[PDB]
Structure formats: structure tokens, C-alpha cells
């Protein structure tokens, strides 16, 4: 049992809140926080940059070692690394960068990684700088993830639209 509070129920297993994922992670200290990564684990902005800053760059230092050993992730792929001061683990998941021509269908493959974890605190993959339509990302999440996922949506206007949309 985690201390997640104030979430709206979307389905049996998907919950959503208008909150900063960093704030939620700091408060709840979940087993798994999801990062919306790129294949190089270069955590520059959005969720990745905010999570990394909250770890005082430890996430990036660890990611540099991961890449030196293993090479880049696949689009739609993932790896499990430490959650540092935020969570037990961080699941780094790469959604497609639709703005750079990558196939939106890989967003389903990306969300499938969530099924390897019983409970996750997560963002909407690909819905920010990667350019996927946010409601599409939410619908893929709902239709793909079967484990318990707590979605933190930073943007208030976006949240209000998402929770008023069919799934
Ligand atoms: N602190 C936050 N808390 C919750 N949601 C957030 C936060 N910041 C952004 N969002 C929302 O989270 C959603 C995802 O936005 P993005 O983080 O861009 O992820 P992507 O998968 O599209 O792009 C991946 C790149 O982003 C990084 O640069 C990586 O290093 C990658 O190169 C949007 O709805 C945001 O409003």
C-alpha cells in the first residue's frame, strides 16, 4: 500500500492526477517511477530533466555508465535503473519521437514495459517534446497497461481536457 492520494480513477487499473511527477515521487517514494526517456538517456527537459535535477544529476551519471556498458536503448524499449532519492527504481522508457519521424505505433510497445511492474508512477509517454497527441498517449496507456499505473500530468489545462475525454 502506497500513499498516493488525490487521484481520479480512469479504469480498474489507471489513475490520474494534476501534479508534478517529481513532487509525487518525493512524497510517495514509490517502488517505480517512469521516465519518458530518449534512447541515449540524455535527460535534458520535461520529465527526464526534472527527475534528473531532483537527483542532483545522479540519474545522469548512472545513465552514462549504463550507456557505456550497454549502448542505446531501442525506441519502445526500456531499462531499470535506480530511483535515487525519488523511488526505489526508475524505469526509463523510450516512446517514439513522432516529431522526428518515428512510428507512433511504437508507443504501444513502450507502454508494454509497464506490465513488468505491479505499481508505477508515470507520465504520458511521447506527449511532450516528442509530439504525440496527449489524448492518444492516454488511450494507448489505458488499452495497453494492465498493472496499476498512477499518471502525473503536470499541465493543468491538459489534465482538464484529458479527464473530460472518452478513453
Ligand atoms: N515534471 C513533470 N511532471 C509530470 N508531467 C510532466 C512533467 N514535465 C513534463 N510533463 C509532461 O509529461 C509528458 C511527456 O513530456 P516529455 O517529458 O517531454 O516526454 P516525451 O516522451 O514527449 O519526450 C521525451 C524527451 O523528453 C525529455 O526531453 C527526454 O530527455 C526525452 O528526450 C507531457 O505531457 C508533459 O507535459
Curated annotation (Swiss-Prot):
Q: What does the record give as the reaction this protein catalyses? A: Thiol-dependent hydrolysis of ester, thioester, amide, peptide and isopeptide bonds formed by the C-terminal Gly of ubiquitin (a 76-residue protein attached to proteins as an intracellular targeting signal)
Q: Which residues form a coiled coil?
A: none
User: Where found in the cell?
Assistant: Host endoplasmic reticulum membrane
Gene label: rep
Q: Report the protein name in the record.
A: Papain-like protease nsp3
Activity modulation notes: Inhibited in vitro by GRL-0617.
In this chain the Macro domain maps to 1-167
Q: How does it sit in the membrane?
A: Multi-pass membrane protein
Summarize the protein's role. Answer: Responsible for the cleavages located at the N-terminus of the replicase polyprotein. Participates together with nsp4 in the assembly of virally-induced cytoplasmic double-membrane vesicles necessary for viral replication. Antagonizes innate immune induction of type I interferon by blocking the phosphorylation, dimerization and subsequent nuclear translocation of host IRF3. Also prevents host NF-kappa-B signaling. In addition, PL-PRO possesses a deubiquitinating/deISGylating activity and processes both 'Lys-48'- and 'Lys-63'-linked polyubiquitin chains from cellular substrates.
**Quaternary structure and interacting proteins, as annotated:** May form homohexamers. Interacts with N protein.
Amino acid at each position: 500500500v502506497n500513499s498516493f492520494s488525490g487521484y481520479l480513477k480512469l479504469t480498474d487499473n489507471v489513475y490520474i492526477k494534476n501534479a508534478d511527477i517529481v513532487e509525487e515521487a518525493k512524497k510517495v517514494k514509490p517502488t517505480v517511477v517512469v521516465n519518458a526517456a530518449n534512447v541515449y538517456l540524455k535527460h535534458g527537459g520535461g520529465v527526464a530533466g526534472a527527475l534528473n535535477k531532483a537527483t542532483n544529476n545522479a540519474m545522469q551519471v548512472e545513465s552514462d555508465d549504463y550507456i557505456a556498458t550497454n549502448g542505446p536503448l531501442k525506441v519502445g524499449g526500456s531499462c531499470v535503473l535506480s530511483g535515487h532519492n525519488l523511488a526505489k527504481h526508475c524505469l526509463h522508457v523510450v516512446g517514439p519521437n513522432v516529431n522526428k519521424g518515428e512510428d507512433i505505433q511504437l508507443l504501444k510497445s513502450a507502454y508494454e514495459n509497464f506490465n513488468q511492474h505491479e505499481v508505477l508512477l508515470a507520465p504520458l509517454l511521447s506527449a511532450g517534446i516528442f509530439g504525440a497527441d496527449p489524448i492518444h498517449s492516454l488511450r494507448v496507456c489505458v488499452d495497453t497497461v494492465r498493472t496499476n499505473v498512477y499518471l502525473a500530468v503536470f499541465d493543468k489545462n491538459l489534465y482538464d481536457k484529458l479527464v473530460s475525454s472518452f478513453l
